[PDB]
A paper describes a structure:
To first gain insights into the inter-domain arrangement and interactions between the NTD, MD and RRM domains of Pla1, we determined the crystal structure of the protein in its apo form. The crystal structure of the full-length protein shows a tripartite domain architecture of Pla1. Briefly, the N-terminal catalytic domain is homologous to the catalytic domain of other nucleotidyl-transferases forming a five stranded mixed β-sheet along with four α-helices. The middle domain is formed by a four-helix bundle which is capped by the N-terminus of Pla1. The C-terminal RRM domain contains additional secondary structure elements extending the canonical βαββαβ topology of RRMs44. It comprises additional helices α14, α15 and β-strands β8, β9 in the extended loop L1 connecting the canonical RRM strands β7 and β10 compared to its homologues. In our crystal structure, 18 residues of loop L1, loop L2 connecting β10 and α16 and 25 residues at the C-terminus are disordered. A large interface is formed by a network of interactions between the three domains of the protein burying a total surface area of ~2982 Å2. The tripartite domain architecture of Pla1 is held together by hydrogen bonds between the interface residues of the domains.
The S. pombe orthologue of the human PAXT connection, Mtl1-Red1 Core (MTREC), is an eleven-subunit complex that targets cryptic unstable transcripts (CUTs) to the nuclear RNA exosome for degradation. It encompasses the canonical poly(A) polymerase Pla1, responsible for polyadenylation of nascent RNA transcripts as part of the cleavage and polyadenylation factor (CPF/CPSF). We report crystal structures of Pla1 in its apo form and in complex with Red1. Taken together, our data reveal the molecular details of recruitment of Pla1 by Red1 which leads to hyperadenylation of CUTs, serving as a signal for exosome-mediated target degradation.
Numbering used by the authors: 14 to 456, 475 to 493, 500 to 550
């Protein structure tokens, strides 16, 4: 048996199921989701280079601390990957989540002070940006064009050999807090792969489920939809229930099992374990915050945590409705009444609601806007919850990405009025602030940089009053310890479907008629 409960079926795939499995993979190819072998080989080469830079880095530190040559050559140091790349389900151009593990005499200070300069001196490295203040400290860069998100963990051992595995829970003892967090992603990815009956079947099924979720716009953790890890664990759970199936069957059965699931019963890939640390483990019977989780997807590595903390009543409802819809499509696919492409039809978010909320973050520099827009976006789920409590609002559906604009205002007064939400007729251009700021590094108008998020409003059966929700949200954002009242502002507006700007419809997409 795989997983905690008995399988639904152990039968081999039928001939028809095998044929639909080939058709599924053909549609994933049709969607161009597989990178070329050349790009795959380039990723292996980049990871091999990072492993050599890691050994060089650890050796340099060891020698600077007066270790002898022999011991400095034994200190080791190892690169790991996790996330989509490690799971083997990543699209062309995707980032590699990467972790460097080092022995106890190499510190997080050496990471940013010693390894960072070593990367900057490589001709293959571009777009290098260190972010030591993040929740998980990180160094971001491209190596030969491959995007790397590099995090760091120091172990309490004198040597990190090339064959080190991170599964033993005791490896967490004596490790600093941020290093324990940096180890979790790799420990989680490895366990998921170990807990499914057939890794090849799991990967194809996850690729389809992930693409479906992105096409339906229910793939963003920050606003309360499941993220990559959460979708991966959901697919893994279904794989456990069909240990002898092919990917077509996993996908076809996935939707109904999960929208009929007895929420909030958790998705667990294995029993929750205890460990040698003194840290909280997910437990609704001890912690009220864990009891409030609506669709808990629990990570299997000690210490277990819920990967879907952010889900609200609204996003729970959207997720379930999307699964109901997909289950009925999959039913038709598996009797050959519809092609697989029918499952991947894009959302109609900007066609389906009569009333939207626009939430705009604005700033006077692109660099300030990037952090401020991120902050405002991260608070949307709290606005969603308060909007639900408005008697007239049944559901507040957040879209899963923001839209960047730049206004080239003619005066400081006009720029102030644009940033505060008195954007009348002032012209703007659609842009990408992240690309602008990065271009500036690699290098009278008063520009205002804005990022707008959208919430679709489902109103109760029988003008809307959102005064308190709006006031509460402004105050929550402006409590940010980095909020700068000379640079940043935020405003909410009501927007009818007919008033949606052209930006929200992709190139060649017709507006609602």
């Amino acid at each position: 048996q795989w997983g905690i409960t008995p399988p639904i079926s152990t039968a081999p795939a039928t001939e028809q199921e095998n044929a639909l499995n080939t058709a599924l993979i053909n549609e994933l190819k049709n969607q161009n989701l597989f990178e070329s072998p050349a790009e795959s080989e380039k990723r292996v080469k980049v990871l091999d280079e990072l492993q050599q830079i890691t050994t060089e880095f650890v050796k340099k530190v060891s020698l600077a601390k007066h270790m002898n040559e022999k011991m400095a050559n034994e200190a080791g140091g190892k690169i790991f990957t996790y996330g989509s790349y490690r799971l083997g389900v990543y699209g062309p151009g995707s980032d590699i989540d990467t972790l460097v593990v080092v022995p106890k005499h190499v510190s997080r200070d050496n990471f940013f002070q010693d390894l960072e300069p070593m990367l900057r001196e490589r001709e293959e490295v571009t777009d290098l940006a260190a972010v030591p203040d993040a929740y998980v400290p990180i160094i971001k860069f491209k190596f030969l064009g491959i995007s790397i998100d590099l995090i760091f963990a120091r172990l309490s051992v004198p040597r990190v050999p090339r064959d080190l595995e991170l599964s033993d829970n005791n490896l967490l003892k004596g490790v600093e807090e941020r290093c324990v967090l940096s180890l979790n992603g790799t420990r989680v990815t490895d366990q998921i792969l170990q807990l499914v009956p057939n890794r090849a079947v799991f990967k194809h099924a996850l690729r389809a489920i992930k693409f479906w979720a992105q096409r339906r716009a229910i793939y963003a953790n920050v606003v309360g939809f499941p993220g990559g890890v959460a979708w991966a664990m959901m697919v893994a759970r279904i794989c456990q229930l069909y240990p002898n199936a092919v990917s077509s069957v996993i996908v076809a059965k996935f939707f109904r099992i999960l929208h009929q699931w007895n929420w909030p019963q958790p998705i667990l890939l294995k029993p929750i374990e205890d460990g040698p640390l003194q840290v909280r483990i997910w437990n609704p019977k001890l912690y009220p915050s864990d009891k409030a989780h609506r669709m808990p997807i629990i990570t299997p590595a000690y210490p277990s945590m819920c990967a879907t903390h952010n889900i609200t009543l609204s996003t729970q409802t959207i997720i379930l409705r999307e699964m109901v819809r997909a289950g009925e499509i999959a039913d038709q696919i598996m009797v050959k009444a519809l092609p697989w492409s029918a499952l991947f039809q894009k959302h109609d978010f900007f066609h389906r609601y009569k009333h939207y909320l626009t939430i705009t973050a604005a700033a006077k520099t692109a660099e300030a806007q990037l952090k401020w827009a991120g902050l405002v976006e991260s608070k949307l789920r709290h606005l969603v919850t308060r909007l639900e409590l408005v008697d007239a609002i049944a559901l507040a559906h957040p879209f899963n990405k923001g839209f960047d604009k730049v206004y080239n205002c003619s005066s400081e007064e006009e720029a102030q009025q644009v940033a505060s939400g008195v954007t009348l007729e002032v012209a703007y251009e659609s842009t990408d602030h992240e690309k602008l700021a990065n271009d500036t590094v690699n290098e009278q108008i008063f520009p205002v940089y804005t990022t707008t998020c959208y919430i679709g409003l489902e109103l109760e059966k029988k003008r809307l009053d959102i005064s308190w929700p709006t006031q509460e949200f402004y105050e929550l954002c402006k409590k940010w310890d980095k909020y700068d009242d000379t640079l940043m502002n935020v405003f909410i507006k009501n927007t009818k479907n007919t008033a949606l700007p052209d930006e929200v419809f992709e190139p060649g997409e017709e507006r609602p008629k």
